[PDB]
């Protein structure tokens, strides 16, 4: 008995995975069907046809778009994340056909899953949205607007979102790909959203990703250097806290990118703060600040402006 062609089996397998769950029997059937379909689209060409696009997006929405540490049926959900990634990354993938089903409502529901407590799920969501942003040109502006709103609600309202760091990782690759002169909206996003993110109590959870976005902005356009540095000194822990190691880490990564033209404009308030870190009661804060002297580029920057920096770093040596 001929068991129908390959495209029909693909559609039926996708619809089997829409029946949400002999409990161990049917869960194993869907797990085998997902792994079977993963291998199908990975090692075959011309298998993602037009009727496949709605079946795949529907199966993903039925399994993933739900009401929300680790997941219960995660080995089942991981296969759906993996199949959908191979779906987006396949050479047969045509965004002109998929945009009828991967739209603003799909993206909006995908972003709400970033609040998941499962780090493995947030990592699959991070990569999924990264592929969607890169391949759907008509959704790029909408995706950044929603990320901007998520960050805004995280700063000035109920300040908790379990995926702030994952969203910053996506933005980092977006900022790294910005074009010739920056759009004015990008500079507004840096000075009014990315910089206020340094005040939140849980900064250490996402500080390495936030610091990468800040140095990528200054690496694109060096004009933002003064308002960026002055904001860091504003949000700097005025109390003697071990959190200053993060700021000292971010400040040196800026100095490895800073231009001599902009460095003169903020050097005095910078090293005045840096001098107080050397005098900190916390050994780790002073240890990190003293490590600046090993940076040959900072040394050259201080040498070309030795008349005003050295009196600050050594107040007893001068006069």
């Amino acid at each position: 008995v001929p068991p129908a062609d390959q495209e029909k089996l693909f559609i039926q397998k996708l619809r089997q995975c829409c029946v949400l769950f002999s409990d161990l029997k049917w869960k194993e059937v869907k797990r085998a069907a997902l792994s079977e379909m993963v291998e199908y689209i990975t090692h075959n060409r011309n298998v993602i046809t037009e009727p496949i696009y709605p079946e795949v997006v529907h199966m993903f929405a039925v399994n993933m778009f739900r009401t929300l540490t680790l997941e219960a049926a995660w080995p089942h959900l991981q296969l759906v994340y993996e199949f959908f990634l191979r779906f987006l990354e396949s050479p047969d993938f045509q965004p002109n056909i998929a945009k009828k089903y991967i739209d603003q409502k799909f993206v909006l529901q995908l972003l709400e899953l970033f609040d998941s407590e499962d780090p493995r799920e947030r990592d699959f969501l991070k990569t999924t949205l990264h592929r969607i942003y890169g391949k759907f040109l008509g959704l790029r502006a909408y995706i950044r607007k929603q990320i901007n709103n998520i960050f805004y609600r995280f700063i000035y309202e109920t300040e908790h979102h379990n995926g702030i760091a994952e969203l910053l990782e996506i933005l980092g690759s977006i900022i790294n790909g910005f074009a010739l002169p920056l759009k004015e909206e990008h500079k507004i996003f840096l000075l009014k959203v990315l910089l206020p993110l340094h005040k939140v109590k849980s900064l250490s959870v996402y500080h390495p990703q936030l610091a990468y976005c800040v140095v990528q902005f200054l690496e694109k356009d060096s004009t933002l250097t003064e308002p960026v540095v002055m904001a860091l000194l504003k949000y700097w822990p005025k109390t003697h806290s071990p959190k200053e190691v993060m700021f000292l880490n971010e400040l040196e990564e800026i100095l490895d990118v800073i231009e001599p033209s902009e460095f003169v404009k903020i050097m005095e308030p910078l090293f005045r703060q840096l001098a107080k870190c050397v005098s900190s009661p916390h050994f780790q804060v002073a240890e990190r600040a003293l490590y600046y002297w090993n940076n040959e580029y900072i040394m050259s920057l201080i040498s070309d402006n030795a008349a005003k920096i050295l009196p600050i770093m050594f107040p007893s040596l001068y006069r």
């Binding site: 991070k126 942003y133 502006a141 980092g172 390495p208 990468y212």
Partner: peptide, 14 residues
């Protein structure tokens, strides 16, 4: 850069 993801070039229209 450790956690850096592949960059996405701003070569589209908005």
């Amino acid at each position: 850069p450790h956690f850096a993801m592949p960059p996405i070039h701003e070569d589209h229209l908005e």
